[PDB]
Amino acid sequence: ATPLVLGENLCSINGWVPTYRGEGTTGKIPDEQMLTRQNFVSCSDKECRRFFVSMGYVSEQMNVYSVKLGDPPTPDKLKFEAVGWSASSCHDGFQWTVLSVAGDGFVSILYGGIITDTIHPTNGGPLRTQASSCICNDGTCYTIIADGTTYTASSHRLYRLVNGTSAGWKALDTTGFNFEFPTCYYTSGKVKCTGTNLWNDAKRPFLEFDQSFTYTFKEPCLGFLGDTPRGIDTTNYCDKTTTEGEGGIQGFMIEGSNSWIGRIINPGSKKGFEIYKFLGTLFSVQTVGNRNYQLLSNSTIGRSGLYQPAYESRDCQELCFWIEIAATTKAGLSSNDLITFCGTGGSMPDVNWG
Amino acid sequence: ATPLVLGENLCSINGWVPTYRGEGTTGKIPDEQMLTRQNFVSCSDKECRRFFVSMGYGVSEQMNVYSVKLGDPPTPDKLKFEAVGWSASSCHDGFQWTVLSVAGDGFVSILYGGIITDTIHPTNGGPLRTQASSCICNDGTCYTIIADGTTYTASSHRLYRLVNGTSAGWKALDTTGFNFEFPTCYYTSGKVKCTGTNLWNDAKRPFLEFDQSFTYTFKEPCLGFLGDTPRGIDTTNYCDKTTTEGEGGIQGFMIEGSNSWIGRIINPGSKKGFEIYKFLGTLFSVQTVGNRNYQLLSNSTIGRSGLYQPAYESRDCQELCFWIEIAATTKAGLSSNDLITFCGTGGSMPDVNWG
Amino acid sequence: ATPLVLGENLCSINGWVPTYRGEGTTGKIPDEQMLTRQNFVSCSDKECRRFFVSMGYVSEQMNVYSVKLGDPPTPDKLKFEAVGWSASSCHDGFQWTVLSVAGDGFVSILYGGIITDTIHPTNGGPLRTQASSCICNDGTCYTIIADGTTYTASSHRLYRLVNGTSAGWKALDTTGFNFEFPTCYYTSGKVKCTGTNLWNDAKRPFLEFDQSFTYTFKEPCLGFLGDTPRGIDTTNYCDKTTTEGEGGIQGFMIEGSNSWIGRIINPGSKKGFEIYKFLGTLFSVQTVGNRNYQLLSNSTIGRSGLYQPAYESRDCQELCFWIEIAATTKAGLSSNDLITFCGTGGSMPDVNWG
Amino acid sequence: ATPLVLGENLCSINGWVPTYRGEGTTGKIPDEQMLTRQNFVSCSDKECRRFFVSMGYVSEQMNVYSVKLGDPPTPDKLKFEAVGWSASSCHDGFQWTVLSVAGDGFVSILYGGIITDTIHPTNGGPLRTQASSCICNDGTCYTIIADGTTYTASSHRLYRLVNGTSAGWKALDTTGFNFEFPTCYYTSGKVKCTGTNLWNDAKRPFLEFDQSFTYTFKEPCLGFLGDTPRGIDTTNYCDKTTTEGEGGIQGFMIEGSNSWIGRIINPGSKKGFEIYKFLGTLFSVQTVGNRNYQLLSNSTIGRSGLYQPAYESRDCQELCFWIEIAATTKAGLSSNDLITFCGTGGSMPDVNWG
Ligand SMILES: *[C@@H]1O[C@H](CO[C@@H]2O[C@@H](C)[C@@H](O)[C@@H](O)[C@@H]2O)[C@@H](O[C@@H]2O[C@H](CO)[C@@H](O[C@@H]3O[C@H](CO)[C@@H](O)[C@H](O[C@H]4O[C@H](CO)[C@@H](O)[C@H](O)[C@@H]4O)[C@@H]3O)[C@H](O)[C@H]2NC(C)=O)[C@H](O)[C@H]1NC(C)=O
Ligand SMILES: *[C@@H]1O[C@H](CO)[C@@H](O[C@@H]2O[C@H](CO)[C@@H](O[C@@H]3O[C@H](CO)[C@@H](O)[C@H](O)[C@@H]3O)[C@H](O)[C@H]2NC(C)=O)[C@H](O)[C@H]1NC(C)=O
Ligand SMILES: *[C@@H]1O[C@H](CO)[C@@H](O[C@@H]2O[C@H](CO)[C@@H](O[C@@H]3O[C@H](CO)[C@@H](O)[C@H](O)[C@@H]3O)[C@H](O)[C@H]2NC(C)=O)[C@H](O)[C@H]1NC(C)=O
Ligand SMILES: *[C@@H]1O[C@H](CO)[C@@H](O[C@@H]2O[C@H](CO)[C@@H](O)[C@H](O)[C@H]2NC(C)=O)[C@H](O)[C@H]1NC(C)=O
Ligand SMILES: *[C@@H]1O[C@H](CO)[C@@H](O[C@@H]2O[C@H](CO)[C@@H](O)[C@H](O)[C@H]2NC(C)=O)[C@H](O)[C@H]1NC(C)=O
Ligand SMILES: *[C@@H]1O[C@H](CO)[C@@H](O[C@@H]2O[C@H](CO)[C@@H](O)[C@H](O)[C@H]2NC(C)=O)[C@H](O)[C@H]1NC(C)=O
Ligand SMILES: [Ca+2]
C-alpha cells in the first residue's frame, strides 16, 4: 500500500469520449434505484466511484453514498459514506477521505469510515463542500470549503488533509467575488480549480495553487461565457462579465496547451452541453478557439465537474469530466443521472450523445 | 501478517458523530435485506464488520450467524456466513476472526477462521450466553466473558482467554450479590474495561476491569444518572446499587476515562431517543460532576447499544466508538432492526438530532 | 500460492458440531434453488465448497456445479464446474482438480477450468468417481475410479495426479468384494478410505495407502453394521457379514485413537443418523464401544462422506463429515440437501439436529 | 507483475471436451441473467472471462460487459467494461485492454478502465472490432479492425498495442475479398487468424503474421466449406468458392500438425455444430481429413471463435473455442449463450454435448 501520486503532465486532449451513460438511456430510470443528488465522480488507486447524496427511492435524513462508476444505485450496490447533504471526496492511496456537511451545517471528515476531524462554521454557516472530487497527491489531500450566509459576502478556505486529519488551512482572498463548488485537477505541480460565482460574474473564476499554498486567482479573458445563467457572448476582455452574473451552476474550464470551456448551450431551457477547444491560455485575449463539440443537444443539463483517473504510472495523466442530467423515473418522478466523458488526443467526429 | 495491537492511549473525546446509519433509521428498510437481530460491531486490522443473527426475508432464512463489512447492506450478495447459533460474540487478533456462537441447548462453539477450534459447556444449568458484543484481542490473545445460570438471581460468569481459537485458560468471576450480562468492552492503559447489564437488582450498570493476568476488580458507578433501561427517577450520587426498578435491563455501556460517559435510552417507557452524558472525572466518585448531555437520537426506538475500537489506524491515539441497535420496519411492514454507529471527536458538538 | 499440505496428526474427537445446515434440513427448499444431487464437500486453502450435480430447478443435461459451503445453490451463487453425472474434486494449493464422468462414461479431468486429461473405460464402463472429495497433499492428488458392468465383477484403480495430469496408477485387488464410493482422509503418512460394498457385505470395507502406492484393505472387526441396508447387529468378527450384504449406500468410518462409525439408524424407512465412538482400532475384535451420538432423528437420510478443512498452520488436523438428506421443495418436488459436522476434542450433549 | 507470455508449441489435440456449458444449452435461461450478445472468451494470467455486449435484462443503448467464465451474467457477478456495441479484448499480464465501438463508429481503447487511445475511420465507417479475443504476447497486443461501408469495398488494419496505446498499424491487402471478425491464436512465433468473407467466399480466408507485421493471407485448399451460408461441398482446390459466398458468419479454422474446421451442420436451419480433423495443413489440396465430430445436435448455432488460456505451467500451449448459440429465457425472449470446448490429446467417443 503506497501513496497515490498523479501524473505531472496531462495527456494532450483533442476530443472527448463517453465512459458511462447513466441508467436513463432508455429514456427512463428504473424505480428501484435511489433518487440521487449532488452527483460527482472520484477515483481511487483501483476504481472510479460515483458519489451522491440521497434520502430514498437540506434534510436531517440525507446520506452520502457511493457506488462503483457504472454500477446502478440499487440497495445491493450502495456503500454508506456519511450523514450529510453536501459532500466532497478523494482517495490518497490508503483510504477514502469523505467530507460531509450535516447537522447545523458543520463538516465531518471521515477516513475509511472513521471521524478524523470536524470543521465548524465561523462566518455564520452553513459550510459548503466543493461538491466535486478533492485532490490527493503524494499523501496529502487538498480541498476548498465555503462559509458565509450570502454569496455577496462569502468566505473561502483552502484545506490540506493528511490521513483525514486537518494539517492546516489558508484564507483565500475572494474580495469582490464569490467562489462556489470549485472543481479541480492536478498538473505541473499545481491544483487548478474552476468555481462558480453566484454573485457577480457570468464567466467562471479560476484558481491555481501549489503545495506551499501559494495561490493565484485568475479571470478567463474569453467572451465564451461558461456560467448558466448568462447573457450574449462578448468580445474578449480580462475582467468580469457582470451582466446576468447573479446565480450560476457548477461547471469547469480546463487550462492547458489546449484549453477548454464546457457550458450549457441554451441558458434558458437548460438544454444541451458543448465543450470548446482553444489554442492557448484561457487568460489571454489573443487566444482563438479551434473546435466546438456539441456533446448533448436534447438532454437538460445541471452540474458538471472534473475528475482524474489515477491508477497509473503512465507517461501522461488522463482527464475526465461528469455531467449531472435531469432524468425522470419510470413511475414519473424527477431525478438525476450522470454521464462521463474522458479525454483523447485523437481528433473526434461530431456525435450527439443525447 | 502481524498481531493486532491497540493504542494504549485513548483519543480525547468531547463529541460524537455518526459513521454508519442504516436505512431503517430514516425510513423503511428495503425488503431485499436480510432481517437482522443481535447486531454488534467488531473491527479487524483491515475493516469494521457488522455481526448479527438472521431472521430471514419477506418468512425465509433464519437461525445463523452472519457478518457484513460495516457500511454495506445485508443483502444476500454481501453476506458472509459465520456459524450456527442464536447468540454470538466475535473478535480479530490480526490473523483470523474468532467467533463464539451459542447453539443447540446452549453450548458454545468457537470458530477460528471458519474452523471449529474449541467448545465450551455449562456447569451451572445453562443456557450459556455470550456478551453479544465484540470480544477484545490484543497482541495475539483474545478475551471474552460468558454467562451461565438459569436465573439472573443466580448467574455465574467467567473470564476466558483465547489464543488462535483455543481456550488458554479461564477465571471464575466473583459476582455474589449482582448480575453481569452482555458486557461491552474497550481496551486502554493496560486494562480491558467492560460495562455489564444487571437484570436482577440494579438500575445502574455493573463495571469490570482486568489485565492479562486475570487480575480484576468489579466497580459500581457512584452516579445518580441511571444507565439501565428499565429504571426509575435519577437519584443523588451514591456508591451502591439502585435496587429500585433494578429488575430487567438492556445491553448498554459506560465509558470510564479522564472524561467519562454514560449512554442511555431517554424515555425508559416508550424506548425512545438516546443520550450520552459527559462527566468530568471518574464514574466511581460521588464528587464527579456532569458536563454535557448530548441527545443524539429522538425520533427512533432504541434497543441494545455496544462499544467497539477500530484498529486499521496509523493513528497516534486509540479511537473509541459505539453502536446502537434500533427498532425498525421493512417496506413490506415486517419489524426488524438496524444500526447507527458513532465515533468520538476531540471537539465539542452542537445539539443536533441524528435519528 | 504454495502447495496444500495437511496435518500428520488428527485432532482428538469426542464430539461433533454442525458447521452448516441446509434449508431442507429445516423444512422445505425454495423453488429458485437448483435441484442438487451427488452432494459432497471438498476444501481449498481459503474456503470449503459444496459440489453437486444438477440438471434443472444419467443424462447429457447433467452438469457439475459448486458453491461456497454456506451459500445456497441459487443461480446467482453457482459456479459451473464440468459436464457430467458423477464427480470428485480436490484442491492442491494451486487449483481445483475436478473429475467428471460424462458422455458415454469416460472421466474428464479439469484443472482450473481447463481439461488436462481423459480416462476411459476398459472393463465395460461406465466409469465411476468416488462421489466425494479426493485427497491432495504436497502438490500431488490421489483418487479412486471404478469400472465394471456390475458390482460382482467390479474393478478399482488408484490414480496419482499432479497439476491435473495422470502420473500413473495402480490396480487394487478387490477379488472377493466391491469397493464403491470411497470417502477418504489423511494422517500419519497414509490416506485412509471407507468404501461401500454393494455386493457381499453389510459392513463397510476400508483402504489405506501411502504416497508410494503400498496399500492394504482392512475389514472392521466389529458388529456395529455401518452399511444400509443391513441386518440385526452382531458379535464382533473379522469377516464380511454377507447378510443383506447386497445393496448399499455411501458412508464412512474413522480410524484413530478414538474411532468412529456413523450410519443410518433405521434401514427400514431411512430415518435418523447416528455416530458411535470406539476406544481403539476398528480392526480388533476386542474393542469396546463408548458414546453413541444421535445427531439426527426425524429426517430421512442418505449419502455421507468425509472432508478435511485444509487451511491451517496447526497443532492438529481437523476432520469433518457431510450428510446428504432427502428434502422437499415448496412446489412439492423431491430433492436433497446437506448438513455438515466437524470434530471437537470435548464431549457433547445429546442434541437432536433434525 | 509480469508480461503474459504464451506457449510456443500447441498441445496435441485429437478431441474436444466442454469446459463451460451455459444454462440455455440444456434448457431455458433464468431471467435474472442479462441479455448477452456478441459473446466471446478472452483469458488472462489468472482467469478466463466471458465478454459480451448487452442492453439490459448499431444500437446506442448498448454497453460492453464481462464476467468470469463459469459465473452467470447476474448483476452481482457483472462487470462494466465500456460503452459500445462491438468489442474485442485481451490481457497482457498487467491489465485488460478493451476495444469498443460506439457513436457513429469510432473505436476506443480502454486499459484498466482508463481511456488510452481512439481509432477513427477514413473510409466511411462504421468501424468493426474482431468481436473475439485479441492477442497479447510478451507485453504487446495485436488486434484487427475493419472499415468500409460495403463488404465489396471493405478495408482492414492490423494494430500493435502497448499498454493500451497504439504503437502503430499496418494496412492489410484484401484486394478481391472481405475479412470480417478474425478469430485468432498464437504459436511458433506467429499469430494465425481465421476470418469471415461476407462478399465472395463460402470458404474462410486465413491470415498469419509475426511480431514485425510480416503477413501472409492464405486460402484453405479444402472443399469442406467453413462459412454459413455455403453451397454443396466441393473438391479440394486452392482458391475462393464464390457461389453462396455472399453473407457469412464468424467462425474458425485451426492450422497444425492436425488441422481442424468447425462449422454449422445445417446452413438453412442453423442447427448442429461439427468439427472436422485434417491430417496436415489446411493449405495443401493433398491433405485428407479423418475424424468428424458432431459436437452439438439440438442447438441453433451462431458465432464461434478461438481462445488460449494462459494461467499455466503446462509444457505445452492449450487451445479452446467458444460457440454462441440461440436461446430463450424462461419468460421466452430470444437471447444467446455460450458453450466452450478445450482440446485434449486423446481421441474421443461420439457424444452429443448440446
Ligand atoms: C425526525 O422527525 C422529524 C419530524 O418528524 C415529522 O413529524 C413526525 C410527527 C412524524 O410524522 C414524521 O414522519 C415527520 O417526518 C423530521 O423532520 C422533518 O423532516 C422532513 C424531511 O426532511 C421535513 O419535511 C419537509 O417539510 C418541508 C416544509 O416544512 C417541505 O418543504 C418538504 O417538502 C420537500 O420534500 C418532500 C419529500 O419529503 C417533497 O415531496 C416536496 O416536494 C419537497 O421537495 C418536506 O416535506 C419536515 O419539515 C421535518 N419536520 C420537523 C417538524 O422538523 C426529521 O427528519 C426526523 N429525523 C431523522 C434523522 O429521521
Ligand atoms: C498516514 O498514513 C500512512 C499509512 O499508514 C502512514 O504511512 C506509514 O508511516 C509509517 C511510519 O513510517 C510506516 O511504518 C513503518 O514502515 C517501515 C517500512 O515499511 C517499517 O520499517 C517500520 O517498522 C514501520 O512499520 C508505514 O510504512 C507507512 N505506510 C506505508 C505503507 O507507506 C503515515 O505515517 C501517516 N501519516 C501521518 C502523519 O499520520
Ligand atoms: C504444478 O504447478 C506448480 C505451480 O505452477 C509448479 O510448481 C512450480 O515449480 C517450479 C519449478 O519447480 C517453480 O519455479 C521456481 O520457483 C522458485 C521459487 O520458489 C525459484 O527460485 C526458481 O527460479 C523457479 O522459478 C515454481 O515456483 C513453482 N510454482 C509455485 C507457485 O510453487 C509445479 O512444477 C507443477 N508440476 C509439474 C511437475 O509440472
Ligand atoms: C497463532 O497463529 C499465528 C499465525 O499462524 C502464529 O504465528 C506464527 O508463529 C510461528 C511459530 O513460532 C512462527 O514461525 C511464525 O512466524 C508466526 N507467524 C506470524 C505471522 O507471526 C502463532 O505462533 C500462533 N500462536 C500459538 C501460540 O499457537
Ligand atoms: C507497460 O506497462 C508495464 C507495467 O507497468 C511497464 O513495465 C514497468 O516498467 C517500469 C520501467 O522499467 C518498471 O519500473 C516497472 O516495474 C514495470 N512494471 C512491471 C510490473 O514489470 C512497461 O514499461 C510499460 N511499457 C511502456 C513503454 O509503457
Ligand atoms: C438433445 O435432444 C434430445 C431430444 O429431446 C434429448 O434427449 C432426451 O433427453 C432426456 C433427458 O436426457 C430424455 O429423458 C429423453 O428420453 C431424450 N429424448 C430423446 C428422443 O433422446 C437430449 O438430451 C438433448 N441433448 C441436450 C444435451 O440438450
Ligand atoms: Ca453567474
Ligand SMILES: [Ca+2]
Ligand atoms: Ca436493571
Ligand SMILES: [Ca+2]
Ligand atoms: Ca452392502
Ligand SMILES: [Ca+2]
Ligand atoms: Ca460467405
